[model samples]
Target chain A: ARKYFVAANWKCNGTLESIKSLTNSFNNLDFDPSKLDVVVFPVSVHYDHTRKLLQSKFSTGIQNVSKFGNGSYTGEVSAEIAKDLNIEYVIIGHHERRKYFHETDEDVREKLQASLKNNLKAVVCFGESLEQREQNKTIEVITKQVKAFVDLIDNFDNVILVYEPLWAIGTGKTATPEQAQLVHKEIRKIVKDTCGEKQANQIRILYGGSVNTENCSSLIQQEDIDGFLVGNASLKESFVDIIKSAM
Target chain B: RKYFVAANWKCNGTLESIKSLTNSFNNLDFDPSKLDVVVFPVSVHYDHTRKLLQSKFSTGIQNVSKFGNGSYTGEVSAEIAKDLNIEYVIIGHHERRKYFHETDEDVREKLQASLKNNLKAVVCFGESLEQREQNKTIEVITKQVKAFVDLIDNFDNVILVYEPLWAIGTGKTATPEQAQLVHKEIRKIVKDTCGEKQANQIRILYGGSVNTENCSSLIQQEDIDGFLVGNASLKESFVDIIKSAM
Candidate 1:
C-alpha cells in the first residue's frame, strides 16, 4: 500500500500577504511523513517565493511544465527550470488546462515524459466531462484518457494518477465514495493490463474535484483511493483538519 | 515614438544563466528616457531577475492567463502579474497561437485582462507563409488588428507587435523594406480605427528573429518604432540590440 498523499492545488489564487498566514498554519502541521505524503502545487509565478517559505515536509510542485525540453518555445516552463528552481513535482493535464488552454492527451504524455527524464515526479490528471458521464460513456472515455498516457509505460515509479471529473471540479459537486472507488478499481485494472500488476498495486491513484475536509476521511477510507488532490478547500484553515483526518 | 527592445528568453535558462546574464545586463549603458527595454523571463526567474537587474531594465512576464484571477489551474492571472510588480506581459505570441490554438478573440480577452489589471500588453500577430504567399497579409492583419483595436482606447498602454510568422527561423527572411511595408499598414489601420494622432503616437515593433546585425537597419524604418528580439535575446549580445535603438 502507498502512503496517503494530500496535495494543495492553490490554483490561480493566493497572494504574498496570504502566503504568510498559510505558511504559519502549514509550518505548524503535525503529521507523520512516514505514513503520509504532502505537497503544494502553486501557480508558476508563485513557485520561487513559495518554495523559500515552505518547510521540507511540505514539498513544492509546479502546476505546469513545458512538454519540450529547454529550448526555443516561448511562454513555456520546462521541467529543467522547475528542477533548477528546486521544485519537486509537476501537475500535468489538469482539466482547466485541458479545457481552457486546449491541452491534448498527447500533450500530457510529453509533459509526463519530461518530468520522468528530469528526475521529478508527475501528478498525471485525467477525467471526463458531465456530458460523457450522462451519456454513460464514462468508462470508455476514462479508459482511453488513462491509457493514452500510460500505454508506453512498463513502470510507474515516478508518476501519480489523478482522476478529476470536470463536472465536479469547482462546481461543489463530488462523486460518492462508491462511485469514486468503482472508477479507481477500473483504473487499477487498466494499469494492471498495460504496465503490469505490481505497478497497479504500488502506484497511487488520487481522486480530485470538490475534495474538502468533510469528505476527506471517507474518501481516503476507500480501498483504491491513495489520497486526494484538494482544490479550494486547501486554501482555507480547515485544510489543516483535512490533513489530520486523512492521517 | 519611444523604441522598445524586448528580449524574450523563451523556455530557456538555468540558475547559472540567471546569475551570469543578470550581471551582464545590469552593466549595459543606456538612457531609459531614450528607449524602453523589458525582458520577458520565464515565470520561475521573476523575483531573482527583478532583484538582480539595475533600474535601467524593466522586467516582464512572458505570458499570463487568458481569464482573470480564479480557479484556472496552471495559469498565472494578469491580476497576479500586476500584483507581482511585473509591468508588461507579452500576449498572443504566435507560438501560443499555433500550439495552444488561441484565436483573435482570445487575444482580445488577454488584452482586456491586461488593461483591466493596469499592465502593459505586448500583443503580437502576423500572417503565416501560406497566407503571405497567397497575398492575404493585409486581410489577415486587418482582422487581427481590428479585433484588438476595439478593445484599445487610442492605443493606450498597448504595444502592437507584428511578428510575421513566415520569417521566424524559416528559409526566407523578410527584407527591411518588407517589414517597413507591413508596419506602415499597421499604422494606417490604427489611424483609421483610432485616429491620426493615435497612429502617429503608437509604437509598433517588428518581431521574427530580430538580432544585433539587423536591429540598426530595422530601427531606422519610419513606421518600425522598435524591435522585439527573440533568438539573439538570450545571449550577451542582447545588450547590443538595446543600444542599436540609439
Candidate 2:
C-alpha cells in the first residue's frame, strides 16, 4: 500500500520574514511522520534559508529544477545542486511552467531523469484543460501525459504522480470525489499495464486542484485517491486539518 | 568618483565554497568607503549568502523576473529582491541572450523593473567573435547599450559592463590597449547620447577573463573604471583585483 503524502507548493511566493513565520507555524504542529509524509515546496531563493530554519522537521522541496546537471545555464536551479543542498524533493512539469514558461513533455522527461540521477524524488505533475475535459478527452490526455514519464523511467519507485486538472486549479472548482477517483483509477491501471501490478500498487498517485480542509476527508476516503498536493489551502493553519482528515 | 568592482559567479560555486570565500572577506584590507564592491551568486544561494556577506560587502542577483508578482513560477522578481534589500541585479548577460533566447526588449523590461524597485543595475553588453572580426564591435555594443539607454532617463543608478564574448572564460584577456579602445568607444557613445556629464559620472566595467596578474595594467587605463572578474572572483585573488583599482 502507498503512504499518504501531502505537499505545499508555495509557487513564487513568500519573503524572508513571511517564510520564517510559516516555518514557525509548522514547527508548532504535532505531526506523525509514520502516518503521512509532509513536504514544503518553497521558491528556489528561499530553499537554503527554509532548510536552515526548519531543520528537517518536515521535508523541504524546490518548486522547480533545471534539466541540466550544471554549468552555463543562467537563472536555473539544477538537480545536482538541489541534492547537494540536502533538498529531498523536486516538483517537475508544474502547470504554471507548462502554460507560461513553455515546458514540454520532453523537457519534463529530461528533468525527471536529472532528479532520479541525483536521488531526488520527482513529483511529476500532469493535467488536462477545460477544453479537453469538455471534449470527453480526459482519459486520452492523461494517458498520453502519464505514458511520457512511464516511457522514460524503468522504475517508478521514487516517482509520485499528481493529477491537477487545469480547469480546477486555483479556480475554486474541484473535481468531485467520484470524478477524482475515476481519473486516479485510470492512472493506476496505466501503471499496472506498463510497470506490472506490484509497482502499480506501490506508487502513490495524488489529487491536486482546489483541495481544502472542508472537502478533504471525503476526497481522501476514495479507494484510489492517495492524498493531495495542496496549493492555497496549504498556506493556512488548517492544512493540519487536511492531514488529520487523511488519518 | 567611486570605482566599482563586481564579480559574476555565473552558474558556479556551492554553499561551502561561498561560506569559505565570504569568510575570507574579513581578511581583506580595502576600505569600502574608498570603493564600491558587489558580487552576484547564482539565484539558489543568493538569500543565505546575502545575509552572511551584507554587513561588509554589497550583494547582487544574477537575474530578476520582468514581471512584478503572482503566478509566474520558477522566476524570482525584483520586487522580492527589493524586499530582501538586495543592492544590485545583473541584467542582459550574453549567456542569457545567447542561450535562453532573450531579446533586447526583454532586457529593457527587466532593467526598468529593477530600477522601479530601486535596485541598482549592472547591465552587461558585448560583441561576439563574429562581430569583432567583421570590424563591427563598436556598432554591436552601441546597439545593445542604446536599447538600455533609450529606456531610462537617469544614468546614475546604472553600471555598464563591456565584455567581449570571445575572451570570457576562454583565458584570452584582451590586451589592456584593446580593452581600453572598446571602453573608450563605449564612453563616447554614452557622451554623445546622454551627454558628457552623465557619461563621466557613469562607471563602465571591462569583463572577460579578468584576473589578478593582468588586473593592475587594465585598472591603470583611463576609460576603464572597474573590473568584472569571472573565474578569479571566486578566489582569494579577487581581493587583488579589487585592491588594484584602489
Candidate 3:
C-alpha cells in the first residue's frame, strides 16, 4: 500500500504573528508519520519562520520554483536553491500557476526535471476542468497531463500527484470519494501505461479541492485517495483536525 | 529631499553567502532618517534576510503579482508583503520588462496593486539602448510614466527608478550631467501630472551599473535624488554607496 501524503498549499498567505499562532496550533498535531507523510508549502516568504517553527511530522516545501535556477530571473526560486535551503518538495504546475503565471506543459516538464536533477521531491498537480468532465473527456485530459511528466520521471518515490478537479477547487464543492477514486484509478493507470504497473502501483496520488474536516476521513478511506493538497483548511488548525481524522 | 537607494540582487546570491552578507549588514551603522534604503531579495530570501535584520534594514520583494494574495502560486503580492511586514516592492524593472514580456499596462496594474495595499513601490522604467541612440529616450520614459498617469493622486509612497539601459554592461556610464538631465525631465513630467509640490517631494533614482567610485559624483547631481544599484550592491561596497547618499 502507498503511504498517505498530506500537503498544505498555504499559497501566498501568512503573517509573522499569524504564523506564530499557526505554529502554536500545529505543535499539538498528532499523526503516524510511518503510515503518512505531511508537508506544508507556505508562501516562499514564510519558509524561514515555518522552518524554525514546524517541529512535527510536517516538513516544509516551496509552493513554486521557476524553471531557471540561480540566475538573472527576478522573483523566481530555482530547485537548486530550494534544495540548498534544505527544502524537499516543490509543487509544480498548480492551476493558479498555469492560468496566472503563464506556465505551460513545457514549463511544467522543466520544473519536475529540475527537481529530480537537484534531488528534491516534487508534488505535481494535474487533472481535467469541470467542463472537461461534463464533456466526458476527463480521462483524455488526465492522461495527457499525466503522461507529459510521467515519461521523464522513472522514480515515482521522489514525486506525488494531486488531481485537481477545476470545478471543485475553492468552489465549496468536492469530488465525492467515489468520483475521486474513479479518477485517481485512471491517473494511476496513465502512469502504468507510460512507465509500468510496478512503478504505478506504489505511486501516491492525492485529492485536492474543498477538502474539509467533515469529509476528509471518508475521502481517505477511498482506495486510491492517498491524501490531500489542502487549501484553506490548511491555514487554520482545522487542518490538524483533517489530518487526525484522515487516519 | 531624502535620498532613496535600492539594491536589486536580481536573482543572485547563495544561501551561505547571503547569510554572511546579511550578517555584515546587520552590524553596519547607517541612518535611514537621511537616506531611505531598501534591499530587494528573491522571494525565498525575504524571511531569512528579515530575521537577520532583527531591526537593521528594510526589505522589499523584487516583484509582486498584480493579482493579490489568493490562489496564485509562486507569486508574492502587495497584500502579502504588507501582511509579512515587508514595506516595499520593486515594480517593473527593465530586466522584468525585457525578459518577462511585461508591458506598460502590466506596470500600471502592479502600481495600482501596490498603492491599494499600502506598500511602497520602487517603480522602475527606462528606454532601451537603441531608443536612446534613436534620441527617443525622453519619449520612451515619458510614455512609461504615463502608463499610470491617472493613478497618481500623490507621491507620498512611490519612488521612481530610471535605469538607462545603454549604460548597463555596455561599458558606458551616464555622466552626472546626462543623468541629471534625465532626472530633471522626470521631475517635470511629475510636475505636469501632479504639479510643483508633489513633483519636488517625489524622489527620482538612477539605476544601471552604479558603483562606489561613480556613486560619489552621481549622488551630487541636483536632480538625481538617489540610485537603484545593480552588480555592486551584492558586495559590501554597497555600504559605501549607502554612506555616499548622505
Candidate 4:
C-alpha cells in the first residue's frame, strides 16, 4: 500500500522568527510514522536554519533545485548542494515557477532528472490553467505534462505527483472530491499504462489546490487521492488537523 | 580611502568545503582598519558561515529578487537578506546575465531595491568577448553603466565591478595596462554623468582571472581601486590578494 504523504510548499514565504514558531508547533505534535509522511518545503534561504531548528522531527525540502550541478549558474541552488545538506525532497514545475520564471516542460524534466540523479526525492507538480479547464483541455494538458516526466524517470517509486489546477491555487477555490478523484484516477491510469501496475499502485498522487482542514478529510477519503500538497493552510494549526484527517 | 576586496564563490563549494575554507581566513593577518573585506557564498550556507566569520569579514549575497517579499517563488528579496544581517548584494554578474536572461532594467531595479533596503550594492558591468573584439568595450560599458546611473539618486553606497567577459574564468588576465585603461574610462563616465565628487567617492574593482601572481601589479594601477576575485578567492592565496591591495 502507498503510505499517505503531506507536504507544505511554503512558496516564497517565512521569516526567521515565524519559522521558529512553526518549528516549535511541529515539535509539539505527534503523528504515526507508519501511516503518513509529513514534509515542509521552506524557501531556500531558510533551509539551513529550518533544518537546525527541526532536527529531524519533520522532513524538509526545497522549493526548487537548479537543473545544473555546482558551477557558475547564478542564483540557483543545485541538487548536489541539496544532497550535501541532506535535504530529502524538492518541488519542481509549480505553477508559480511556470508563470513568473518561465520554466518550460523541458526545464521541469531536466530538474526531475537532476533531483533523482542526486538521490533526492522529487515532488513533481503538474496542472491545467483556468483557460485549459474552461476549454475542456484539462486532460490533454495534464497528460502532456505528466508525459514529460514519464519519459525521463525510469522509476516512479521516489516520485510524488501533485495535480494543482492553476485556477484553484491560492484562489480559495478547490476541485470537488469527485472532480479531484477523476483526475487522480486518470493520472494513475496513465502511470499504469506507461510504467505498469506495480509502479502505478506504489506511487502517491497528491491533490494541491487550496486544501484546508475543512475539506482535507473528504478529499483524503477519495480512493485515488493518496495525499495533499498544501499551501496557506499549512501555516496554521489546521495543518495538524489535515494530518489527522489523513489518519 | 578604503580599498575593497571581494570573493564571489559562485555556485561552488559545499558546507564542509566552506567551513574548511573560511577557517583558513581566521588565521590570516590583515589590518581591517585600512581595507574592507567581503565575501559572497552560495545562499544555503550564508547564515552559518556569516556568524562564524562575522568579526573577520563582511558577508554578502550573490543575488536578490527583483520583486518584493511574498508569493514570487524561488526568488530571495533584498529585504530578507537585510533581516538576516547580510551587508551587501552582488547584482548583474555576467553569468546571471548570460544564463538567466537578466536585462539591464532588471539589474537597475535590483540595485535600487538593494539600496532602498539599506544593503550596499556591488553592481557588476562588463563588455562581452564579442563587444571587446569589435573594439566597442568603452561604448558597451558606458551604455550599461548609464542604465544604472539613471536609476539611482545617489552613488555613495554603491561599488562597481568591471569584469570583461573574455577574462573571467578564462585564465586570460587583461594586461594591467588594459584593465587600468578601462577603469580610467569608466571613472570618467561616472564623473561626467554623476559629477566628480560622486565619481571620486565610488570604487571600481577589476574582476577577471585575478590570482596571487598577477594581483600586485593590478593593485598598483592608478585607477583600479581593488578587485572582485573569483577563482582565487576560494583559496588561501586570496589573503595574498588582500594584502597586495594594502
Candidate 5:
C-alpha cells in the first residue's frame, strides 16, 4: 500500500529555544512511520537543528528551492544545497509565496523541474483564490497549475500534488470532504486524461486548506484524499495529532 | 585560557533536529575547562541552539550584519549576533567567499567591524581551485591572509582558520602531511608579518572536510591545533572529531 504523507509547514513560527521543547515533545510522541510519511518543514533557520534530531523517522521539506540550483542567490535555498544537506523534499508553491513573493505558475514549474534535476521530491501546491472560486474558475486555476508543471516535466514521478484553496488557508474554513473530493477527482481525471490512466491513478493528491486534527480523520478517510499539506497546526503540538489522525 | 573550536553549521539542519542534536551534545562527557567548544549554527538555528547549547558550550555565528542595522531585509547584524551573546564570528568562510560572491575586501571590512564591535574574529583563508590549478596557490593565499591581519600587529584576540578551497565538500581532502606543510608555511608568514611572539600565541585551525576519520592525524600535526568543521560538524561525527583533539 502507498503510504499517506503529512508535512508540517511551520511557516514563520518558532525560535531556536522553542524548537528544542517542540522537538522534545515530538520525540515523546508515538508516530507510525510505516503508515504515514511524516515531515516537518521549518524555516531555513531550523534546518540544521531539525535535520540533526529528526533523522530517518521524520523527513524535511524546504519551503522553496532556488531556480538557479546554487551560487550567488542570497536568501534562497537551492536544490543542490538542499540535496547536500540531505533534504528530502521541497514545496514549490504555496498561497503566501504566490501572493507575497510574486511567484508565478511558470516560476513554480521551473522550480519543480529544478528539484527533479537534483533528484529531490516535490510537494507542488495549487489552489484558487476566493474570487476565482466565486467566479467558478477554481477548476481552471487548478488545472492550469497542474498542466504547467506536468508539461514542464513531461512526466510526474516524485511529485506530490496538494489542492489547497487560497481562502480556506489559515482562515479556519475548510472545504467539506465532498467539496474537496470534487476537486481531487477532477485533478485525478485531469492527470489521467493528460498523462495516462496509469500515471493519474498512481499520483497522490492531498488537501491543504485549514487542515487540523479535528477534521483530519474524516479528510484522511476519503477515497480521493491521500494526505495533507498542513499549515498553522504544523507549528503546534497538533501537528503530531494530525499525523496520527491520518494513521 | 579559553581554547575555542567553532563548528560553522553552514545553512544546515532544521529546528526539530538541532534541538535533540544539541541536547545529546549537552549530555556528552567532556572537559569545558580545557576547551571552549561552540557551534556557529546558521542565523536561523542560532537563536534556538544558542540557548540550548549555552549552559554547555559557547555560541558563535558565521555571518552577521552586512552593512547597517536597519531595513536590510534578511540580514542579521554584528550587533544582533552579539546581542544574542555570540562570542565568536567567522567573518569570511571560503565557501561564503566563493559561493556568496563575498570579496576579500568585504571580508576585511567585516573583520574590522567585528573587531570594533568587540566580537572575536575567526578570519579564514584558502587558495581557490583556479588558483591551485595555476600553481599560484601560496602566492594568492598568502596575499589574502596577510591583508586581513596586516593591520593588527597583535594576535591575542584573533584566530586564524586555514581552509583549502579545493578540499571543501569536494570529497578530496588535504592529507595531514599536506596540511602540516601549508600550516607551517602559514605560521612562518604570520611570524614574518606579525612577529614570532604573536605567531606562536595564535591558534591556527585547519578546516574543510575535517571529519572524525581524518581529524586525528590532522589535529596531531604540530602546526594544527583544532578544526573549523563543515559537513561533519552537524552530526555525531562532530563529537568524534572533537574527541580526536584530546
Candidate 6:
C-alpha cells in the first residue's frame, strides 16, 4: 500500500492563469509516486489543461460526481465523464453538498455506485456535526453515516473512508492527532466488523477538514490517519513539501 | 433589433456531432448580421465547436465560475470562458437551479460576475410546474425577472429568456399566441419598469420546447421575436428553425 494518499480539492477556485503557476510548481516538484499517492483536484475548467502539465508522479481527482448517470443533469459532473477525463478518484458526499445541496445518503449511494461502476475509486466522506460530537454521539453519527453504504455495497476495497467532522472543516480548527486517531480507530473497527479484517486493514482511511502543511506530519504519522484529503493547503506550492514530508 | 436566439447544448454534442451541424450551417444561406445567433457548447466541446463555428456565428457558455480563485475543484470560471472568446453567457438555467439548487442570490452574483468579466448575459426566468399549478406564473416570473433586473446598473448587456418549466423538453410548447401574450406582457413590464427605449432595445426570447415546425408561427407573432432552442438544437432541425427565423 502507498504510505500516504493526498488529494487537494481546489473547491470552487482557480482561474486559468493561477492554476498554471500551481501546475508549474507541481511539474517541477520532485516526488516519488511509489511511496506516496498524490492527486490534485483543480476546478473542472482547468482539468484538461492542468492534466497535460501534471507529472506522472501524481494522480488527479474530481471534487464531486453527479448522482445521475448522464444526460439532462446540468452543472453536475458524472463519474463516467470524470473517468473519461482520466480522473482516478472522486469525492462523494462531502459536507458541502450534504448541507447546501440537500444531498441525501441515497444521493451519495448513487454517486458511489456510479464511481465503482465507472471503474473509478472513490473517497466517500462521513462526519458528525459539532452538536453531535458534543453529545458524545460521534461514534453513532459516524457509524450511521458509514453503515448506509457499507451495508448497501458490501465491498470496501475500491473505496476509501474520509472522516471530516463538519464543525472542523474550513473552520481553522482541526482534530487533535489523538482525537482523530480515536475516531479513525473506531472507523477501522467498524470496517473490520462490517466488511472483514483483511478488507478493513487494507483500506486507506483519510483525515480531512482543515488539513494543511502545518499539521500534516503529525496527522499522517497517526497509526489510523492513513493519509489526508486536503482542502485549503492543496492549492499552495507547499503541497509538494507536504507530500514529500509525508513520504 | 430583433431578439437574440440562442442554443444551450447542455452537456450534449461531441466533436463528430458538432462538425455536421457546423458544416450544415456553413452550407446554409442565412444572414447572421440580421439576428443575434449564438450556441453554448459543453465545456469539453467548446474549443472544437468554437473552432468550427469561428467567424460564422457567435458563441457563449452555459455556466460560469461560482468561486473567485483557488481550489474549489471541478468548476469553470466566467473569466476562463470569456478567455476562449465566449461572447454570451446563459446564466440560471432551470436544470441548474433545480438539480444543483442554485439560489436567486447565486443567480444575482453570477450576473454580477458575468458583467464584471465583460460578458453579455442571457438571464433565464421561469415558474416551475408546481408554481404554475398553484397559479403563480405571473407572480413568480415577475418576482424573478424583477430581482434579476434590479441587480444590474444597466440592462443593455442583458437578454431575458422566459422558459416556462412546464414546457421545457416535454414536447409541449407555449402556443404561438400564448408565447406572444407573455412576450408582450414582458415587454410591457420592462417598459413600465425600465422605460420605453430600454424595453424596445432589450431582446426577449421564448424558450422551452421550441422546434422548427412551431418556430414559424412563434416568430410571426408581433412581440415573439426568436427562440432559445433546447432539444431541437442537437439535430438537423435547428437549421430549419434558423431558416424560419430568417
For every model in order, the fraction of real contacts preserved is 0.84, 0.59, 0.74, 0.65, 0.04, 0.45
Query: TM-scores for chain B, in order?
Result: 0.97, 0.95, 0.95, 0.95, 0.91, 0.92
Instruction: Give lDDT tens digits, candidate 5, residues B1-246.
Output: 234566777656666678778877776677877776878765544657777774667777776444544322234456555544567888777766654566778778777767776778788888866777798777987888767887554475678888887775566667889888888889888888888888888888887667777888887888887888776777865777777765
lDDT-wise, the better of 4 and 5 is 4
**DockQ scores of the candidates:** 0.80, 0.57, 0.64, 0.69, 0.06, 0.46
- Writing each residue's lDDT as its tens digit, candidate 3 over A50-156 gives 88898857777998877877676766787887887889889998998887766778888988988888999899988777778779999988888887888778677
What lDDT score goes with residue A22 in model 1? 88
Report the lDDT tens digits of candidate 4 across residue range B1-246: 468899888888888888878888877777777888998888887876786674869889889888887777678888788777788889998888887778899999898888889988888989977788899998999999988886555565688999878776565658999999999999999998888887888889987778899988987898888888887888976888888877
- Chain A TM-score of model 6 comes to 0.93
Go through the candidates in order and give each one's C-alpha lDDT: 0.85, 0.82, 0.83, 0.84, 0.73, 0.76
**Model 5: runs farther than 4 Å from truth?**
A152-157, A170-174, B1-246
Task: Report the candidate with higher lDDT, 1 versus 3.
Answer: 1
**Model 3 spans with C-alpha error above 4 angstroms:** A170-174, B26-28, B54-56, B133-135, B153-156, B166-178
- Please give the lDDT score for candidate 4: 0.84
Work out the iRMS of candidate 6.
3.0
By TM-score, rank the candidates, best first.
1, 4, 3, 2, 6, 5
Q: Give stretches of model 2 more than 4 Å off.
A: A134-137, A151-157, A169-174, B51-54, B133-139, B151-154, B168-173
TM-score: the better of candidates 2 and 3: 3
Best candidate per TM-score, number?
A: 1
Docking class of 3: medium
lDDT of 2 by residue, B1-246 (tens): 578899788767778888888778657767777888898888777866776674658888888887886666677888888877878998888887876667788889999999899999988889877788799998898889888786556676898888888676655558889999999999999998888888898888887678888888887889988877777888977888888877
Error of 6 at B148 (Å): 1.2
lDDT of 6 by residue, A1-247 (tens): 5256877777876666778798898788777787777877765555666677788787877777878775775556677666665678788888876875678888888888888888888888889988788788998998888887875544555688889877666566657878889899999999889878887888889987677777888888889888888877877888887786677
In angstroms, give how far residue B242 of model 5 lies from its true place.
Answer: 27
- For model 6, the local distance difference test gives 0.76
- The alpha-carbon lDDT assigned to residue A130 of candidate 2 equals 84
DockQ of 4: 0.69
What CAPRI class is candidate 4? medium
Q: What is the per-residue lDDT of model 6 for residues B95-129, given as tens digits with 9 covering 90 to 100?
A: 88887778777788888878887889888888876
Clash numbers, per candidate: 0, 0, 0, 0, 21, 14
